[PDB]
């Protein structure tokens, strides 16, 4: 099945894409994110390893794009990297989620390009608070050094590291949020309001929190969001009231903060559980989602309701069928419109750009 | 034990 779809994808790449690059990493990555700086041009990616042994690393890769893929640095990491995210105000600083439940902070510029063969991990900060590992990880883009994390322990932790010397120290969570009653799968700050953030969990809820509230056990809003676990959310960077959630129910839901009683839209086409959803960094109507069905779907909300001649609803702009295994993470390139990096369980990293005629 | 990661990742050397 997979093998037949893939053969058909390969034949069609020149008509569906302006760019496709494929690279098989040594070990699969659970995480992917484009760093914001660009020096053809040179772009960089934060990646991690997931191994059957003890050779784990935080990884920075370089990618040459029209204006090859190489490992620039590996940094010893304690166990697999569940997720890694750079701090928007200083992208030398990367947070990572470890299986032990610690969240680690690295300044990658402080490390040798070849990792220490001893295998020792030497993080610049070790952030304590969780009793279990997890995935959700989010830096506040309006308040430097405030980091949210979501865990399988049912909690969200918040740290404020802005006054802490990055000299190897342990920092406890400033606040712990306890409103969910099951694994918290994802957490994200609002992109314009420094006090607001969302969380989603296996209790099927989206919660909206306000850090100004004295009550850490009850959010400002609690939304019955999906008919199964909610794995990811993303706030729209250009539309202050709009956000999206993705779920084991196979849908992405669209929400408005002004009235969360009613879902705005349900984007339906995935055939299996969704793990990631991200808004386009360039276009306010554009989002993407990926997961267990090995597909990455790109949606355009300006097309909801449009007359068609179907293969899918009109808001489905593009299905990326290049991966042949579950997609673990993906990232929109913030410097070259429509370029995405996606990574899958079978070690494949793809860097691709759909054909201009599709969105044009 | 977490359902979100496969239990047996494979190396490509």
Curated annotation (Swiss-Prot), chain A:
Keywords on record: Acetylation, Cell cycle, Chaperone, Chromatin regulator, Chromosome, DNA damage, DNA repair, DNA replication, Isopeptide bond, Nucleus, Phosphoprotein, Repeat, Repressor, Telomere, Transcription, Transcription regulation, Ubl conjugation, WD repeat
Positions of crosslink type Glycyl lysine isopeptide (Lys-Gly) (interchain with G-Cter in SUMO2): 114
Outcome, altering residue 185 to A: Decreased interaction with ZNF827
Effect of residue 133 to A: Loss of interaction with ZNF827 and loss of localization to telomeres
Alphabetized SUPFAM superfamilies for the sequence: WD40 repeat-like
InterPro entries in UniProt: G-protein_beta_WD-40_rep (IPR020472), Histone-bd_RBBP4-like_N (IPR022052), WD40/YVTN_repeat-like_dom_sf (IPR015943), WD40_repeat_CS (IPR019775), WD40_repeat_dom_sf (IPR036322), WD40_rpt (IPR001680), WD_repeat_RBAP46/RBAP48/MSI1 (IPR050459)
Region (Interaction with ARMC12): 1-86
One family name in Pfam for this protein: WD40
Known tissue expression: Expressed in neuroblastoma cells.
Ranges occupied by WD repeats: 17-79, 80-129, 130-177, 179-224, 225-268, 269-321, 322-354
Gene3D superfamilies, A to Z: YVTN repeat-like/Quinoprotein amine dehydrogenase
Effect of residue 231 to A: Decreased interaction with ZNF827
Record's protein name: Histone-binding protein RBBP4
UniProtKB/Swiss-Prot annotation, chain B:
Family as reported in the entry's similarity comment: Belongs to the FOG (Friend of GATA) family.
Top-rank taxon, per record: Eukaryota
Record localization: Nucleus
Subunit description: Interacts with corepressor CTBP2; this interaction is however not essential for corepressor activity. Interacts with the N-terminal zinc-finger of GATA1, GATA2 and probably GATA3.
Tissue specificity field: Mainly expressed in hematopoietic tissues. Also expressed in adult cerebellum, stomach, lymph node, liver and pancreas. Expressed in fetal heart, liver and spleen.
Domain remarks in the Swiss-Prot or TrEMBL record: The CCHC FOG-type zinc fingers 1, 2, 3 and 5 directly bind to GATA-type zinc fingers. The Tyr residue adjacent to the last Cys of the CCHC FOG-type zinc finger is essential for the interaction with GATA-type zinc fingers.
Function of the molecule: Transcription regulator that plays an essential role in erythroid and megakaryocytic cell differentiation. Essential cofactor that acts via the formation of a heterodimer with transcription factors of the GATA family GATA1, GATA2 and GATA3. Such heterodimer can both activate or repress transcriptional activity, depending on the cell and promoter context. The heterodimer formed with GATA proteins is essential to activate expression of genes such as NFE2, ITGA2B, alpha- and beta-globin, while it represses expression of KLF1. May be involved in regulation of some genes in gonads.
Biased composition (Basic residues): 1-13
Covered residues, full protein: 1 to 13 of 1006
The protein's name: Zinc finger protein ZFPM1
């Amino acid at each position: 099945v997979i093998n037949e779809e893939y053969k058909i994808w390969k034949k069609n790449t020149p008509f569906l894409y302006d760019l496709v690059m494929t690279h098989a990493l040594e070990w699969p990555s659970l995480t992917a994110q484009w760093l914001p700086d660009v020096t053809f041009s040179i772009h960089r990616l934060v990646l991690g390893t997931h191994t059957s042994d003890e050779q784990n690393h935080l990884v920075i890769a370089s990618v040459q794009l029209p204006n090859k893929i190489e490992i620039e640095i590996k940094i010893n990491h304690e166990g697999e990297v569940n997720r890694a995210r750079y701090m928007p105000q200083n992208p030398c600083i990367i947070a990572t989620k470890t299986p032990s439940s610690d969240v680690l902070v690295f300044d990658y510029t402080k490390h040798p390009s070849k990792p220490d063969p001893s295998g020792e991990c030497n993080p610049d900060l070790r952030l304590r608070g969780h009793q279990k590992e997890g995935y959700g990880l989010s830096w506040n883009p309006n308040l430097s050094g405030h980091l949210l994390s979501a865990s399988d322990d049912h909690t969200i932790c918040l740290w404020d590291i802005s006054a802490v010397p990055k000299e190897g120290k342990v920092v406890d969570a400033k606040t712990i949020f306890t409103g969910h009653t099951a694994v918290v799968e994802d957490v994200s700050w609002h992109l314009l309001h420094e006090s607001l953030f969302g969380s989603v969990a296996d209790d099927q809820k989206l919660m909206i929190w306000d850090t100004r509230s004295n009550n850490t056990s009850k959010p400002s809003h609690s939304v019955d969001a999906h008919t199964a676990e909610v794995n990811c959310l993303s706030f729209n960077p250009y539309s202050e009231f709009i956000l999206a959630t993705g779920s084991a129910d196979k849908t992405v839901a669209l929400w408005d903060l002004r009235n969360l009683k009613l879902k705005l839209h349900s984007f339906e086409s995935h055939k299996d559980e969704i793990f990631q959803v991200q808004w386009s960094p360039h276009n306010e109507t554009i989002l993407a989602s990926s997961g267990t069905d090995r597909r990455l779907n790109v949606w355009d909300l300006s097309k909801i309701g449009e007359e068609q001649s179907e293969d899918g609803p009109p808001e489905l702009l593009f299905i990326h069928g290049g991966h042949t295994a579950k997609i673990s993470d993906f990232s929109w390139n913030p410097n070259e419109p429509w370029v995405i990096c996606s990574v899958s369980e079978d070690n494949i990293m793809q860097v691709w750009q759909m054909a201009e005629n599709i969105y044009n | 034990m977490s359902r979100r990661k496969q239990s047996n990742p494979r190396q490509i050397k």
